[PDB]
Design a protein around this ligand. Structure first.
Ligand SMILES: NC[C@@H](O)c1ccc(F)cc1
Ligand SMILES: NC[C@@H](O)c1ccc(F)cc1
Ligand SMILES: NC[C@@H](O)c1ccc(F)cc1
Lengths: 13, 344
């Protein structure tokens, strides 16, 4: 049970 | 024990020293087109800061144009990262890195015009088929190993490896794109950035970190290519982060033991033990048993038959890309954020 679609990168978490 | 391999290591050194000299000439001495020179065809990918579009040079050649809205690139690190991407892409040259052709800006936007790679993202092929066989995944992984060996030798870290950023070309080979997180780092760096499932534990823990985060991400990528899902897998980023920092990886029962051994050494929270980060550097990966069938030079020279070749109907074919909502570009009468983007 996790993310299956495209994943957004984060520039400053 | 388990002759040519050592002459092979001298040849690597020789190639990398020549690569560094070419890179440094372009890095030291980096507005080569204009918007009206291109027709905009279809959006190929989107993000928080803009889109990448298929465009056609009004020469006829097709390109992938990344359009960044200067008014969305607002946070400090978002701005620095954009300058990194342009300066790195204009200076590197390698068979598995996308080629930047042109860059320019106007009142509203930054533009980076790259070669169009029509085979689609690895991401959609992998999600469509489920998972790749170990020989299939190995072929792609070998190209990433060589690409990182190249980038790290120039002191560049890549920092966003994942199937979304890997395009398949007309020969079935990979082209790495999306250098928005890439950076020249001779020691450590401190920005908390990347894609949650792919972050090494030291990033999450706010520790200064180095190129070893790329090798951890290679472990995530190989696992995802061979399993169809990544090793730290949860609904919410905070849950993903907890799993990563424990680093208690479980493997599918169909993974070979050679694959599991490589992955345990890449997905190693202890940096004094992580492959790619030790005294033998990349060679601990290249000489691992899971890669024993890999002809590194033949991959580099593109002599190896690819697992599959994407189907293409002609130039400008977009059939291997998903669809995205379109939004017309609006160039403001007034220049925006001219100060932040003066070096672009
Ligand atoms: C665009 C691509 C992929 C996805 F999962 C959602 C939107
Ligand atoms: C041989 C060629 C290229 C490279 F990056 C490593 C080894
Ligand atoms: N994540 C890949 C997306 O940004 C992209 C799509 C198509 C392309 F030719 C370049 C980049």
């Amino acid at each position: 049970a996790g993310r299956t679609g495209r994943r957004q990168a984060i520039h400053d978490i | 024990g388990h002759a040519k391999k050592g002459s092979e290591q001298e040849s690597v050194k020789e190639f990398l020293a020549k690569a560094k000299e070419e890179f440094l000439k372009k890095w030291e001495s980096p507005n080569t087109a204009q918007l009206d020179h291109f027709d905009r065809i279809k959006t190929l990918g989107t993000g928080s800061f803009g889109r990448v579009m298929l465009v056609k040079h009004k020469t006829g050649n097709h390109y992938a144009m990344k359009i960044l809205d200067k008014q969305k690139v607002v946070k400090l690190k978002q701005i620095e990262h954009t300058l990194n991407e342009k300066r790195i892409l204009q200076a590197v040259n390698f068979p598995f890195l996308v080629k930047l052709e042109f860059s320019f800006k106007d009142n509203s936007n930054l533009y980076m015009v790259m070669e169009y790679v029509p085979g689609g993202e690895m991401f959609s092929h992998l999600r469509r088929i489920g998972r790749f066989s170990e020989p299939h995944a190995r072929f792609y992984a070998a190209q990433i190993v060589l690409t990182f060996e190249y980038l790290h030798s120039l002191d560049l870290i890549y920092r966003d490896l994942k199937p979304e950023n890997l395009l398949i070309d007309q020969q079935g080979y990979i082209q790495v794109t999306d250098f928005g997180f890439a950076k020249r780092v001779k020691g450590r760096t401190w920005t908390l950035c990347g894609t949650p499932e792919y972050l090494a534990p030291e990033i999450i823990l706010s520790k200064g970190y180095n190129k070893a985060v790329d090798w951890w991400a290679l472990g995530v990528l190989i696992y995802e290519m061979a399993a169809g899902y990544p090793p730290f897998f949860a609904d919410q980023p905070i849950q993903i982060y907890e799993k990563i920092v424990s680093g208690k990886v479980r493997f599918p029962s169909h993974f070979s033991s050679d694959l599991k051994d490589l992955l345990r050494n890449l997905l190693q929270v202890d940096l004094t033990k992580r492959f790619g980060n030790l005294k033998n550097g990349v060679n601990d990966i290249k000489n691992h048993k899971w890669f024993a069938t890999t002809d590194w030079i033949a991959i580099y020279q593109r002599k190896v038959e690819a697992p599959f070749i994407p189907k293409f109907k002609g130039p400008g074919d977009t059939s291997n890309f998903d669809d995205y909502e379109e939004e017309e570009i609006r160039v403001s009468i007034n220049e925006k954020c001219g100060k932040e983007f003066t070096e672009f």
